[PDB]
Design an enzyme around this catalytic site. Structure first.
Site, PDB file in Angstrom:
ATOM      1  N   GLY A 294       2.548   5.611  14.465  1.00  0.00           N
ATOM      2  CA  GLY A 294       3.549   6.400  13.747  1.00  0.00           C
ATOM      3  C   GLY A 294       4.007   5.728  12.458  1.00  0.00           C
TER       4      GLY A 294
ATOM      5  CB  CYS B 246       2.617   1.789   8.429  1.00  0.00           C
ATOM      6  SG  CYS B 246       1.568   0.722   7.601  1.00  0.00           S
TER       7      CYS B 246
ATOM      8  CG  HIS C  62      -0.457   0.226   2.531  1.00  0.00           C
ATOM      9  ND1 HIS C  62      -0.627  -0.723   3.518  1.00  0.00           N
ATOM     10  CD2 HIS C  62       0.258   1.230   3.101  1.00  0.00           C
ATOM     11  CE1 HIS C  62      -0.048  -0.316   4.639  1.00  0.00           C
ATOM     12  NE2 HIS C  62       0.494   0.869   4.406  1.00  0.00           N
TER      13      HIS C  62
END
Lengths: 302, 302
Positions: free
Chosen positions: A143, A145, A41
């Site tokens: 914070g 990912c 993503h």
């Protein structure tokens, strides 16, 4: 002595973290040999997040659209492909710090250490269990990912998890290093939900056995119980019902200590029904469910 | 909403761990530049441990009695001296992984990460606070003395603790890196009991502020209190009395949230008297006392 929940030393993993940026998104990647693994993503926005066609987005990009920084030093991407929900980036330099490693898929109830990162920079490590609903409660101060879960077997690093998103309940979902999610979750900003937050009964039992091993034994009792009745009580209190494989797994701890699994189950049944009336076990004023049967068999007694 | 106590990534400290052996006893050492620091009782047989003559066992030792191993490499010791409860071994090689570092003495209530070892072999890492009685609740294996406690400030490692002893209660005692014990303890087998454990009120309040910062604030009551009356309730519940010094330390969190310290004191006071009653705070059903005001600030300027 006594008991403290511990994570595995993070050094071997720290040397494999990098930063991956696409457009305006910056997140953590795992550099092993000549590859960098990260959640696919990173190629999205927030608009795209709503219903993304990853095959479509991926083809609109070049090796040059990807910026991977190992510290303040840039790595050159010379290729890319998608393997389920991860992006697999080929880079021009093999990581001199690559530890001996394996990719393994874990199951609910199992434990591992997590090196939480910050847009490429490691900032904390913790020990956790994959919950029965396939989520992780490591409530990241939200914070960065794409952090990673692992275990260390002798000198070998077993990577088992990579962070992907926060579920609308506040808990986390992710993937194994093959890019396949843990749980019935997907790569999209469609509100979906985790199953019921339950206690890992098998781990609490392992933990009670550890308490016995270290001399704590006040919760024990002379009663025994059947698996079914134990399970009926378990469920009423939001504890996972124990399957027959789970009691086999507790054999070794039952053999040492000399307390039969159903005897220990009878001890837990009484704790559930009567609370602890201000009292402690191995310290905590509450039952710990993030130490596995193997964890107890590791630390305390070979 | 969420939490997870994290320890600092342990990599820079793993690079400084070595194993020190003197006869039958093997324990961990901290290697910075060309000195290896370790507990002085490594020269003591499990026999002398009742009441050792350290000055004499030392006199009777030559550099050659000391075996120091860093991985598969033997470091030759070329000098040895004592500083309080620590041994300082000068070695043939200066540690190439030595991080920028400082030695600091922390006070009760403050937190740090612990790299738990076993014969120069880092096997676990955890986050803990020095308890109000100057002890530490460590989960300890066997052969972990010389496990070190530390903080990481940027790229700088602040070493604040080194393990030495296991006390009656099962809790731990150790020293700063100049060898002086934290608390009224000594490196000898004697009755010596620590003071009553007790909860770190200051960290609990700092935790309530972080709960509020992340949107979990149902516990606030618009019904205030006096410091004096807050402290009397805190003592009923085995919580340390909050000194004016501590109220001051909560100042930055007070300013950041708009919640006066005494209002947070009144929220705590009400939680002690009434309980949480099923409800959650940062996901826990129990109050966390090993997260400091500073850790809240650092893990919110993320």
């Amino acid at each position: 002595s006594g008991f403290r929940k511990m994570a595995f030393p993070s050094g071997k993993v720290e040397g494999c973290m990098v930063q991956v940026t696409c457009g305006t998104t910056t997140l953590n990647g795992l550099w092993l040999d000549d590859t960098v693994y990260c959640p696919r993503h990173v190629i999205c926005t927030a608009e795209d997040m709503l219903n993304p066609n990853y095959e479509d987005l991926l083809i609109r990009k070049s090796n040059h659209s990807f910026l991977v920084q190992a510290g303040n030093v840039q790595l050159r991407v010379i290729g890319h492909s998608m393997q389920n929900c991860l992006l697999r980036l080929k880079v021009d330099t093999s990581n001199p710090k690559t530890p001996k490693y394996k990719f393994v898929r874990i199951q609910p109830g199992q434990t591992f250490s997590v090196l939480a990162c910050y847009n490429g920079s490691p900032s904390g490590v913790y020990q956790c269990a994959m919950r029965p609903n396939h989520t992780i409660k490591g409530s990241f101060l939200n914070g960065s990912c794409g952090s990673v879960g692992f275990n260390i077997d002798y000198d070998c690093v077993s990577f088992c998890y990579m962070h992907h998103m926060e579920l609308p309940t506040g808990v986390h979902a992710g993937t194994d290093l093959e890019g396949k999610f843990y749980g019935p979750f997907v790569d999209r900003q469609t509100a979906q939900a985790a199953g019921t937050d339950t206690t890992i009964t098998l781990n609490v039992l392992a933990w009670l056995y550890a308490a016995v091993i270290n001399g704590d034994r006040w919760f024990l009792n002379r009663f025994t119980t059947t698996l079914n009745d134990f399970n009926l009580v378990a469920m009423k209190y939001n504890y996972e019902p124990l399957t027959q494989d789970h009691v086999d797994i507790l054999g070794p701890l039952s053999a040492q200590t000399g307390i039969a699994v159903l005897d220990m189950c009878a001890a837990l049944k009484e704790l559930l029904q009567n609370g602890m009336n201000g009292r402690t076990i191995l310290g905590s004023t509450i039952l710990e469910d993030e130490f596995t049967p193997f964890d107890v068999v590791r630390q305390c007694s070979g």
